[PDB]
């Protein structure tokens, strides 16, 4: 077994670090695959970071892994950082790829290929879970906040890119000029799923409406993925495959 109390503590600490590595990087791989194949195109390009589609889609598809990892970590260890660790791992993988491949392999500027910020939403989700340990309360209030705070959290980053520019007779934002100048051979402009205006777009409501829709759908997706993570935690021994 173990020699003494001290050696047990040291063994537990070593296990803690190794299992933290395993959790963090398996989450990085799986969450990054899910994110980049469910929100990657908006996350890739500043001229894709719009007010309708980016704000709508990103929190909805990104609340998935935080819900499951929360439902496991909080329930089994009272560790209230499942959402934070998921978001940090996604950001780390995204930034590594942006710097070494988007800017390293290809030579797209970082101010063009930067990822979105998600830590505020993750922190809200984690704190709202730890306080008032109710998973239902988390799914309703914390997911609401996660959806709502996405665009305001990223506004300090993308606001300078929205300064209007008179570009060769046409009005363009700085992000628009970035997308125009830095040629993406595989990504023509029409692929861009961004706000284009509708006849039923009343007043200045595009960003808040998208944020509230994303918050509601985030509630729904969090509710689903809490139980998905509950299943993924199963310790069953399927006798034969």
């Amino acid at each position: 077994a173990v020699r003494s109390h001290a050696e047990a503590v040291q063994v537990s600490r070593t296990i803690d670090w190794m299992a933290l590595f395993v959790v963090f990087f398996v989450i990085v791989g799986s969450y990054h695959i899910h994110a980049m194949l469910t929100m990657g195109d908006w996350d890739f390009w500043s001229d894709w970071k719009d007010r309708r589609l980016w704000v709508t889609v990103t929190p909805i598809v990104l609340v998935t892994f935080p819900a499951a990892v929360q439902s496991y970590l909080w329930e089994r260890y009272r560790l209230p950082w499942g959402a934070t660790v998921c978001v940090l791992g996604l950001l780390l993988g995204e930034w590594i790829n942006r710097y070494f491949n988007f800017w390293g392999w290809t030579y797209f500027p970082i101010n063009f290929v930067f990822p979105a910020s998600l830590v505020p939403g993750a922190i809200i989700l984690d704190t709202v879970l730890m306080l008032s340990g109710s998973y239902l309360f988390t799914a309703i209030v914390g997911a609401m906040g996660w959806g709502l705070i996405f665009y305001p959290g990223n506004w300090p980053i993308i606001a300078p890119l929205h300064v209007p520019v008179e570009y060769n007779g046409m009005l363009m934002s700085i992000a628009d000029i970035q997308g125009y100048n830095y040629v993406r051979t595989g990504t023509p402009e029409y692929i861009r799923m961004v706000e284009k205006g509708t006849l039923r777009t009343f007043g200045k409501d595009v960003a808040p409406v998208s944020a509230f829709f994303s918050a509601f759908m985030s509630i729904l997706i969090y509710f689903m993925w809490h139980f998905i993570g509950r299943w993924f935690s199963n310790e069953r021994f399927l006798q034969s495959t």
Binding site: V2, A8, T14, F25, G29, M36, G93, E235, F237
Partner: protein
């Protein structure tokens, strides 16, 4: 002794090999690797594909066969100290699996959000594909299968039955590799847009979700760690 320096090798081998792979693809991405019908493409990326597939098959066969042949027959007469050492070795295997999963499913996958988004595909064997699906995926599949086999053949907790969370964690991410068929079919036919979030990607996603079974796998390994040498100290 307990946890030994096999963990350092587990990290370093993947780090060094994938850094060299990244250097190789940085050197031969353009300039023998843009035109899939050029003769230099055959010598620098098709040969890479052939060699890597053969080496992956050989390495998987050898590693899995050795792990299964050296399986512990007398698991009953295993001391708690030896069980703790084997649990640490299995944790090293899981660390290697996590590192390989990162390299495969994050780095080289999004590295494509960087290759195609920039070039016009020329084939189902983009040099990067010759890196992601035919390396960043078989390598982590081999590591996951090896970790599962080691758990089953050395840990009494993971013996006497197939653990469902471990099986999911090991096989689901494997299903991403045959899912490449859906990727190809739904790139050439369905969807000519380079949309990364196209439904032709819900195939790595669905099976990327199965990696969440690492949570059940890890609580199982925690219980296996805390069998005889659980303490005391912990809960005392």
């Amino acid at each position: 002794l307990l946890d030994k320096k096999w963990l350092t090798f587990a990290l370093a081998i993947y780090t060094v090999f994938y850094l060299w792979v990244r250097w190789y693809e940085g050197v031969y991405g353009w300039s023998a690797g843009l035109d899939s019908f050029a003769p230099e493409f055959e010598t620098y990326w098709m040969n890479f594909l052939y060699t890597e597939i053969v080496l992956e098959i050989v390495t998987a066969s050898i590693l899995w066969g050795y792990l299964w042949k050296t399986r512990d027959r007398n698991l009953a007469a295993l001391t708690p100290r030896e069980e703790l050492r084997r649990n640490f070795t299995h944790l090293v295997w899981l660390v290697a699996y996590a590192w390989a999963i990162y390299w495969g499913a994050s780095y080289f996958t999004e590295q494509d959000g960087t290759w195609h988004q920039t070039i016009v595909r020329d084939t189902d064997f983009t040099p990067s594909h010759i890196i992601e699906f035919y390396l960043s995926y078989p390598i982590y599949i081999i590591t996951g299968f090896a970790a599962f086999i080691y758990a089953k053949t050395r840990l009494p907790f993971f013996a006497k039955g197939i653990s469902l969370p471990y099986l999911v964690l090991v096989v689901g991410p494997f299903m991403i590799l045959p899912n490449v068929g859906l990727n190809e079919w739904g790139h050439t036919f369905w969807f000519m847009e380079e949309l990364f979030v196209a439904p032709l990607h819900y195939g790595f996603v669905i099976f990327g979700w199965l990696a969440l079974a690492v949570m059940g796998t890890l609580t199982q390994t925690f219980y296996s760690f805390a069998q005889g040498g659980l303490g005391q100290s912990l809960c005392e």
